Design a protein around this ligand. Structure first.
Ligand SMILES: *[C@@H]1O[C@H](CO)[C@@H](O[C@@H]2O[C@H](CO)[C@@H](O[C@@H]3O[C@H](CO)[C@@H](O)[C@H](O[C@@H]4O[C@H](CO)[C@@H](O)[C@H](O)[C@@H]4O)[C@@H]3O)[C@H](O)[C@H]2NC(C)=O)[C@H](O)[C@H]1NC(C)=O
Ligand SMILES: *[C@@H]1O[C@H](CO)[C@@H](O[C@@H]2O[C@H](CO)[C@@H](O[C@H]3O[C@H](CO)[C@@H](O)[C@H](O)[C@@H]3O)[C@H](O)[C@H]2NC(C)=O)[C@H](O)[C@H]1NC(C)=O
Ligand SMILES: *[C@@H]1O[C@H](CO)[C@@H](O[C@@H]2O[C@H](CO)[C@@H](O)[C@H](O)[C@H]2NC(C)=O)[C@H](O)[C@H]1NC(C)=O
Ligand SMILES: Nc1ncnc2c1ncn2[C@@H]1O[C@H](COP(=O)(O)O)[C@@H](O)[C@H]1O
Ligand SMILES: *[C@@H]1O[C@H](CO)[C@@H](O)[C@H](O)[C@H]1NC(C)=O
Ligand SMILES: *[C@@H]1O[C@H](CO)[C@@H](O)[C@H](O)[C@H]1NC(C)=O
Ligand SMILES: [Ca+2]
Ligand SMILES: [Zn+2]
Ligand SMILES: [Zn+2]
Length: 817
C-alpha cells in the first residue's frame, strides 16, 4: 500500500500511485521511479528490484524467474542472492586454466580504455577497486611506453601489429599520402580504404592459423586487410553505450565452439573524452575513471557467471596518456613566418609541416629553408624544427612518405599551430607528445591463466604486446618490431625460447705485414711516446691476451650479423676493436674505464701512428685532414685515457682507431670523453664502453647494405670517404656499484645514437655554457641497445651467463630520468 513493488502501472485505491500521471500530482509511492521507470535505463539490479514483477521495457531482469529465462542483470547474484562479486573475492592463482571444450587454447581479450594515463592508477587507485584488484592479482607495469606520436590510431594499430607507425602506415589520426594523393581522416570514407593499413593485425595472423576473432571496435577491425575482416566486427559508432559493448562480447563467449572467437577486442572512448573536455585533473575525469572501472567490473562479473574468469586472458591497456594544454603554452608559426598561404601545418604537440601545393612540390619544397628560419629564434625556445631523419632514432618516425619531411619536437605541455584559427580550444587536455614523457605513459594489466600473479614488471613498449598475444594464442607471430622473448618474464609458461642470433662469417685475421714507416704528415706533441718496435709491442703472449680479453670484452665481443661483410679483430693493451676492410674504419671498439683511471688534458691533435696490420690509405694520414674544411677525424677508443701512466695512451693513436668526424661533432665527442665518461666512471665504480659509427642513409633504423654504402661515399681531396650518419655509445656497469663492470651479477646499461651533423644548430649553442647542452643532446638521443643492434648490425652480451630472455629484457630497456 506504500510501495509500487508488484503493481507498476496498475490503478490503486490506497493512497500512493504507480502510474505516469502520479508524477505531475506529486502522489507517487516513494519507490515509483526505482521500481517502474529506472529499469528501462539501467543494466543493474538493486534492493528495489530484487524479486520484481518482470517489466516488458526493462533492459535486464531481477525477477525470481530471471535465471530460468537467462536474462538476469549481470550483478543479480551479488545483489539479490548475497553472493560475492568478482572484485569482492580474494586473489587466487590460475595455474591450470578451467576452460570449456574449444578453449584448449584459452581466449585473449584486448580491452582498451582510451587516454587512460598510467598516473591515473598511481594516484586514484583507491577510487578504482576493480582495476586495482586486476593489478594486485595479475601482471602490471607502472608505465607502458606508447609509440610516437601518442595518438589513438597509431597506438591501437601498433598494439595489434607489433609495428612502429612508420612501418604500419597509420602515422596519425590525419595523414596525407603523396603517392595516393589522398587525405586520411577518422570521419572520412578513406578510413575504410585498405591502402592505408600495412603489416598484419593479430586477427589476420589468427585467421591464417585457424582461430576466429570478435572485435567490438578497434582501429583497422572495420577495414578489409589482406582481404580479411575479423569473423565478428562492428562498424565504429561512439554512441553505443559501454554496457552494450561488454554484453555483446559476453554473447560471443557463449557461441558454440565452431563459430566462437579466441581473440576479442573491447574499446571505450573514456577517459580520453573527459580528459580532452575537462583536463586530466578534474571532477569529470574522476567520474569517467570510476565509470570505466565499473565497466571492467561488469566484464569480470559476466565472465564469472559464465565460469570463464579462470579461462580468459585479459589485457587491460590504453593507447596513450593525457596532458593539460594551456593557451599560454601554444606556439604560432605566423609570428615567425607571417600569414603565408603556401604551407599546411598539422597542429598539436606532434606538429608537422607540408606544402599546400601537393603532390607537386611535396619532395621539391624548401623544408631546410623553413627549418633554418625557425631554429634558435629565441632563448629557451619550447619547440624545435627537425627534418624527419634528424629526429631521435628512438622515435622510429621517418621511413614512411606519409611523415611530412619537416616535423616539430615540442617540450612537455607545449603545442604548435600555424595560427590561432587552425587549432581547437588551447585549454583542452591533449596528447601526441614524445612517448617518454611521464603523462603520455599508458595502462597495462594482464590477468588470466597465461599471466603471472602479483608481479610488477619494469617499463616495456606497446610494440612488444603483439608477440605476447601470439604466445597466449599459440600463434607464430608475423615479422614485427617487438623482440620475441623480451616479455617471457610476464608469462607462467613461455612458449618461445629465444636464442642469440648466430654470427654469419667467423672473424678474418689482420696479420702484421713488414712495411716501411711512411710519413702521415703529423706534427705530434713531443710528450707522446711513439711506437718504436711495432712487431715487439703487438706480439702478445696467450697469458697476456686472456688478461686483455677479460678486461675489454667482459660480456664477449660484439658479433656481426651482416651478410656481405669482412671484419678482423685488432688487439691493443687498453681496448679491442672490429675493423672493416670494406669501409676502412672500425665498426666497434670496446674498452673499460676504471674508477681511479687518469684522463689527460694534453693535446694529441694532428698525431697518428701507422698500424702495420692494415694497408695504409690516404684517408688514414694526418695530411688528408690538415686544414681540411669538409671533414676532420676522431678516435673510438680515447687517447685521453691512460691505465699504466698519466700521459697519453699512444696505441689509441693507431690509424685503425679513427673515424671521419665533422668539426662541429668534435665538441660533443671531446666533452663526452674529457668530462662525462670520467663522471660516469666515478658514479658507477667503472664503465665498459662500446662505441662505433652508424650508416643509416635510408633513415629506416637499419644498418645500410655494403652495396648501398658504395654509392654514399663522398669525394674529398680526390679521395672516396664514407662519413657516418650517427655514432653509437653503449655504457655498461653493475646494478650493485660495490662490484665493477668485470664482475656484475646484474648489468645497468645506457645507450646513445648521436646524430653526426655538420653544425650544432639542434642544440642552439649561442650564449650558453658548453657543459649544459651536450648532456641534454645525449639524453634526447638515448636509445635501447636493441635500437643500436638494428642500426649497426651488431649483437652484444652474447657471452653473459643469464638466459637469453633476461638479456632481451635488458636490450629493450630505455632509461627514464
Ligand atoms: C620493423 O619491422 C618491420 C617488419 O619486419 C621491418 O620492415 C621491413 O623492412 C624490410 C626492409 O626495410 C622490408 O623487406 C624487403 O626489403 C627488401 C630489400 O630491398 C626488398 O627486396 C623487399 O621489397 C620487395 O620487392 C619488391 C620491390 O618493391 C616488391 O614488389 C615486393 O613485394 C617486396 O616488397 C622488401 O621491401 C619489409 O617489407 C618491411 N616490412 C614491413 C611490413 O614494413 C622494419 O625494418 C622494422 N623496423 C626497425 C626499425 O627495425
Ligand atoms: C549508433 O549507435 C547508437 C546507439 O546504440 C544508435 O542509436 C539508436 O538507434 C536505435 C535504432 O535501432 C534507436 O532505437 C529504436 O529502435 C526501436 C526498434 O527498432 C524503435 O522502435 C524505436 O524508435 C527505438 O528508439 C535508438 O533511439 C538510438 N539510441 C540512441 C541513444 O540514440 C545508432 O542507430 C547507431 N548508428 C548506426 C550507424 O547504426
Ligand atoms: C590531387 O588531389 C587534388 C585534391 O583533390 C586534386 O585537385 C583538384 O582537382 C579537381 C579536378 O581534378 C578540382 O575540381 C579540385 O578543385 C582540385 N582540388 C584542390 C583542392 O586543388 C588534383 O587534381 C589531384 N591529382 C593530382 C595528381 O594532382
Ligand atoms: N575505430 C575508430 N574509428 C574511428 N574513429 C575512432 C575509432 N576509435 C576511436 N575513434 C575516435 O577517436 C577518438 C580518440 O582520438 P584522440 O582524441 O586522438 O584520442 C575517439 O573519441 C573517437 O571519436
Ligand atoms: C622566414 O621566412 C618568412 C617568409 O615565410 C619571412 O616572413 C621571415 O622574414 C623569415 N625569417 C627569417 C629570415 O628568419
Ligand atoms: C690550419 O690548421 C692549423 C693547425 O693544424 C691551425 O692552427 C690554423 O688555424 C689552420 N689554418 C687555417 C687556414 O685556418
Ligand atoms: Ca638503413
Ligand atoms: Zn586515444
Ligand atoms: Zn584523445
Amino acid at each position: 500500500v506504500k510501495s509500487c513493488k508488484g503493481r507498476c502501472f496498475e490503478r490503486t485505491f490506497g493512497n500512493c500511485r504507480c502510474d505516469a500521471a502520479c508524477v505531475e500530482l506529486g502522489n507517487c509511492c516513494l519507490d515509483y521511479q526505482e521500481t517502474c521507470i529506472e529499469p528501462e535505463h539501467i543494466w543493474t539490479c538493486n534492493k528495489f528490484r530484487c524479486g520484481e514483477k518482470r517489466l516488458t521495457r526493462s533492459l535486464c531482469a531481477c525477477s525470481d524467474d530471471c535465471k530460468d529465462k537467462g536474462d538476469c542483470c549481470i550483478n543479480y547474484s551479488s545483489v539479490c542472492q548475497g553472493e560475492k562479486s568478482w572484485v569482492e573475492e580474494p586473489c587466487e592463482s590460475i595455474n591450470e586454466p578451467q576452460c570449456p571444450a574449444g578453449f584448449e587454447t584459452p581466449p585473449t581479450l584486448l580491452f582498451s580504455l582510451d587516454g587512460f594515463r598510467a598516473e591515473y592508477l598511481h594516484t586514484w587507485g583507491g577510487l578504482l577497486p576493480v582495476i586495482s584488484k586486476l593489478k594486485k592479482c595479475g601482471t602490471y607495469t607502472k608505465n607502458m611506453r606508447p609509440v610516437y606520436p601518442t595518438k589513438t590510431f597509431p597506438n591501437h594499430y601498433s598494439i595489434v601489429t607489433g609495428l612502429y607507425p612508420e612501418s604500419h602506415g597509420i602515422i596519425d589520426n590525419k595523414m596525407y599520402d603523396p603517392k595516393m594523393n589522398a587525405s586520411f581522416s577518422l570521419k572520412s570514407k578513406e578510413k575504410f580504404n585498405p591502402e592505408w593499413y600495412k603489416g598484419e593485425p593479430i586477427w589476420v595472423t589468427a585467421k591464417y592459423q585457424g582461430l576466429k576473432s570478435g572485435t567490438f571496435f578497434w582501429p583497422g577491425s572495420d577495414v578489409e586487410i589482406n582481404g580479411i575482416f575479423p569473423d565478428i566486427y562492428k562498424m565504429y559508432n561512439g554512441s553505443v553505450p559501454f554496457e552494450e559493448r561488454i554484453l555483446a562480447v559476453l554473447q560471443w563467449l557463449q557461441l558454440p565452439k565452431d563459430e566462437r572467437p579466441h581473440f576479442y577486442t573491447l574499446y571505450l572512448e573514456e577517459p580520453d573524452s573527459s580528459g580532452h573536455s575537462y583536463g586530466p585533473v578534474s571532477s569529470e575525469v574522476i567520474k569517467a575513471l570510476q565509470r570505466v572501472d565499473g565497466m571492467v567490473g561488469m566484464l569480470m562479473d559476466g565472465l564469472k557467471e559464465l565460469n570463464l574468469h579462470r579461462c580468459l586472458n585479459l589485457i587491460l591497456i590504453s593507447d596513450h596518456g593525457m596532458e593539460q594544454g594551456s593557451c599560454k603554452k601554444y606556439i604560432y608559426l605566423n609570428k615567425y613566418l607571417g600569414d603565408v598561404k603556401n604551407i599546411k601545418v598539422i597542429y598539436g604537440p606532434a606538429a608537422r609541416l607540408r606544402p599546400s601545393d601537393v603532390p607537386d612540390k611535396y619532395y621539391s619544397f624548401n623544408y631546410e629553408g623553413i627549418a633554418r628560419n625557425l631554429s634558435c629564434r629565441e632563448p629557451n625556445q619550447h619547440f624545435k624544427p627537425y627534418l624527419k631523419h634528424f629526429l631521435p632514432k628512438r622515435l622510429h618516425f621517418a621511413k614512411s612518405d606519409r611523415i611530412e619531411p619537416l616535423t616539430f619536437y615540442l617540450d612537455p605541455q607545449w603545442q604548435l599551430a600555424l595560427n590561432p584559427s587552425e587549432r581547437k580550444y588551447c585549454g583542452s587536455g591533449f596528447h601526441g607528445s614524445d612517448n617518454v614523457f611521464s603523462n603520455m605513459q599508458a595502462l597495462f594489466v594482464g590477468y588470466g591463466p597465461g599471466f603471472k600473479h602479483g608481479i610488477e614488471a619494469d617499463t616495456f613498449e606497446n610494440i612488444e604486446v603483439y608477440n605476447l598475444m601470439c604466445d597466449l594464442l599459440n600463434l607464430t607471430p608475423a615479422p614485427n618490431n617487438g623482440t620475441h622473448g623480451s616479455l617471457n618474464h610476464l608469462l607462467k609458461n613461455p612458449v618461445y625460447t629465444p636464442k642469440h642470433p648466430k654470427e654469419v662469417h667467423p672473424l678474418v685475421q689482420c696479420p702484421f705485414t713488414r712495411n716501411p714507416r711512411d710519413n702521415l704528415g703529423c706534427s705530434c706533441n713531443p710528450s707522446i711516446l711513439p711506437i718504436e718496435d711495432f712487431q715487439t709491442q703487438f706480439n702478445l703472449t696467450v697469458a697476456e691476451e686472456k688478461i686483455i680479453k677479460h678486461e675489454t670484452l667482459p660480456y664477449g665481443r660484439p658479433r656481426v650479423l651482416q651478410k656481405e661483410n669482412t671484419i678482423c679483430l685488432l688487439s691493443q693493451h687498453q681496448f679491442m676493436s672490429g675493423y672493416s676492410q670494406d669501409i676502412l674504419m672500425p665498426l666497434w671498439t670496446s674498452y673499460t674505464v676504471d674508477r681511479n683511471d687518469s684522463f689527460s688534458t694534453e693535446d694529441f691533435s694532428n698525431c697518428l701512428y701507422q698500424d702495420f696490420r692494415i694497408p695504409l690509405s690516404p684517408v688514414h694520414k694526418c695530411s688528408f685532414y690538415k686544414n681540411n674544411t669538409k671533414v676532420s677525424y676522431g678516435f673510438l677508443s680515447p687517447p685521453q685515457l691512460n691505465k699504466n701512466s698519466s700521459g697519453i695512451y699512444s696505441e689509441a693513436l693507431l690509424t685503425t682507431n679513427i673515424v671521419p668526424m665533422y668539426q662541429s661533432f668534435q665538441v660533443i665527442w671531446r666533452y663526452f670523453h674529457d668530462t662525462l665518461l670520467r663522471k660516469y666512471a666515478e658514479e658507477r665504480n667503472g664503465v665498459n664502453v662500446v662505441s662505433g659509427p652508424v650508416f643509416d642513409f635510408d633513415y629506416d633504423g637499419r644498418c645500410d647494405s655494403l652495396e648501398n654504402l658504395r654509392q654514399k661515399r663522398r669525394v674529398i681531396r680526390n679521395q672516396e670517404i664514407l662519413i657516418p650518419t650517427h655514432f653509437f655509445i653503449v655504457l655498461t656497469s653493475c646494478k650493485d656499484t660495490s662490484q665493477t663492470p668485470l664482475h656484475c651479477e646484474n648489468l645497468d646499461t645506457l645507450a646513445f645514437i648521436l646524430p653526426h651533423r655538420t653544425d650544432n644548430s639542434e642544440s642552439c649553442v649561442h650564449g650558453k655554457h658548453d657543459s649544459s647542452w651536450v648532456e641534454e643532446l645525449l639524453m634526447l638521443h638515448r636509445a635501447r641497445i636493441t635500437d643500436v643492434e638494428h642500426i649497426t648490425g651488431l649483437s652484444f652480451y652474447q657471452q653473459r651467463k643469464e638466459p637469453v630472455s633476461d638479456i632481451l629484457k635488458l636490450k629493450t630497456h630505455l632509461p627514464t630520468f
